[PDB]
Structure formats: C-alpha cells, structure tokens
Amino acid sequence: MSGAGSKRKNVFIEKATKLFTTYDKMIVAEADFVGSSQLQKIRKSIRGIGAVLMGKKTMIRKVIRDLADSKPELDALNTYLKQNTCIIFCKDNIAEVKRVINTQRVGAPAKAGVFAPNDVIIPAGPTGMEPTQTSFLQDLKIATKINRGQIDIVNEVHIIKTGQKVGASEATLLQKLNIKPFTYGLEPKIIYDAGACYSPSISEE
C-alpha cells in the first residue's frame, strides 16, 4: 500500500491548524500505552482545561505554535518526543499542572514480558476448581485460592504486590492468573510552564 498509516491524509493537516495555543501551560503525556476504554472515563476535568489534542505527525509542526507565545520552540534544548506522546493544554496553576493527569488516573493490564506493579485488589467470582493451578502457585507464597461459600481458582485479594517487581521471571506466574488489573496510573513525559521545564512529578513541586 502507500499513504500515511495505511491511507492518504485529509484530516491530519487540520491538527496543526486545530487551535491557536492560547493556553499558557502544556504537558507531554504518555497516556497511549494505557487503553482507550479506561482513558475516556477519567477525563472529565482533563478536558475543559484545554483538552487532549494534537497529532504526533504534527508534534514536529508544534514548533510554529511556540513562536506565537513567549515559549521557546524546544522545551529544555529537546522536545522530548521518542514515544507515543500527546500534548495536553492546561489552564491550571503553576503548581496544579504538575499533577493535572494524575489527579484522576488508572493503569492497563500487564502484558507478556513485563510484571508491572499491582496495588489494587484482583476481582473474584465463581470459576470452578483446578488441582494443577495449585502447583503453579507453589512458586508464589500463598498456596490457597478457595475462599468463602463460593469456589474459584483465584483469590479476592491481591497476592502480587510491589517489591516483587522484576524484568522477566515472575511475569510468567501472572499468565497463570486469569485476570490482570495492574494499576500504575498515567505517565508524565515532562512538566512545563512557559519557558522553564521540569522533570515528571506527582506532587505540587
């Protein structure tokens, strides 16, 4: 084929001329690796402050929308764009913009080849019984899955916790588990006012 993704462009020309950069605060956010199903529910105060906007073909064309403002073109001698990264325009204060996305956040399920931190409890419900499942749970510390009047092969409380994070060893034991609600929020690429740039943050500073 021959095009852009796999078809020629007629709406990505409009992403540069989508708005004027009237808003004084922007931030590069990594909300693409988290899924679109959960991404639309957390964003209610996230849109109305400037919205989640702009394409990633036009992220290089973004430079003509910084010359209008007092902002320099690059953020801190680098645009910081080597990832699925989108711009979120904000009207919230200099301290509030540091935690604008993390105020309402949620993660996606853990994939093959990565563990990810699991802070929230795992779901429950009737899923039969399996004796071979107990042999795989011997690697883990808790070897008990049947709880209460119901019967099932996974617990109602998270056994996978922070501290057990690794590259690729205990990640195979999560494929034995039948459900993956791995919460680690969303990820700031950088924080930025209108001239000065900062590192990713969760606090007011």
């Binding site: 639309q40 529910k41 964003r43 209610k44 849109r47 779901p123 419900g125 209460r148 009047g149």
Partner: protein
Amino acid sequence: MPPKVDPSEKVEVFLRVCGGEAGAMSTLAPKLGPLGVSPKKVGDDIAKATQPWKGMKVSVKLTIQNRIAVPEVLPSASALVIKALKEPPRDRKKEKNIKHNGNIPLEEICKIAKTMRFKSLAVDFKGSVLEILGTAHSVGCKVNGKSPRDIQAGIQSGEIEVVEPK
C-alpha cells in the same frame, strides 16, 4: 443504573437479556452449563419486574447475585428508556413480531437517563443526547425534525439546534 445492592460474598455479575414479561429464565452461568456454585435464581418473575411496559423484545438486563438474592437492575439502556413511553400495543404481543414504529417526542425522558448510561464522557447530558439519541434509532424519532439513522437531520443539516437543549 448502578447495582441496587452491591454483590457480597465475592462479586457476581451475569449477562442474559431476559426479554419480555413471559418466561422463567435467570442468569447464573451463561458461559458454562446450568449450575455455577449452587441453585439460586432468585425468583422467576424478575423479567416481568424489570420489563413491565419497557419492551416485549430485545430488552437487556444486568443480572447480578448477592449470595442468593437479586434486586432487579437494568442498565438504563438506549433502547429501554425510549420504548418505556411508547403505547401498550407496541409494548405487548410483539415478541415474535418486528417493530419499526415510533416517532413521538422522547426528549424529556432521555435527559435524566443520560447520566445512567455513562457518568463521564465530557459532553452535555441534555445537549449531546439530541445527537446520540433521536437520530440513532428507528423506534424513536423524538421531534419530527430529526431523521431516523441518516445524514439529513440530527447533525444540523436541517436542524438549527444541535448542542443546545430543546
């Protein structure tokens, strides 16, 4: 709607439509055979309770379990709320019969039900509902300015109001 009573003794949520008044169907294991853990419906006339004058036909139901209890809950669906206001002839004895009939105003009743469908999409519950409902059905036109699933009306190509509440 959200659940009326929260599932206790581990969460239990099951999904079969249970359409119409008639029938003694209940959901405990739609992916497996009949039994889940134990026999517990509860009640055969739950369908009737859920769908008295909301439909005889493709009428959705969020079946749950509170360890041997069901409090009757429906999703406030895009089909169920519009068909509630419709006349009893098209809500009764249409179980083995097609229905593509209903062009009366349903403007007021869907506004309150818009929060129950979704609670966070960054849109107006009385403004964006005139686009999302009304011009997305063949059994519900609302005002006759709109067109049933077309590109003639509902997106302001004939309408003048579209994001504003009527």
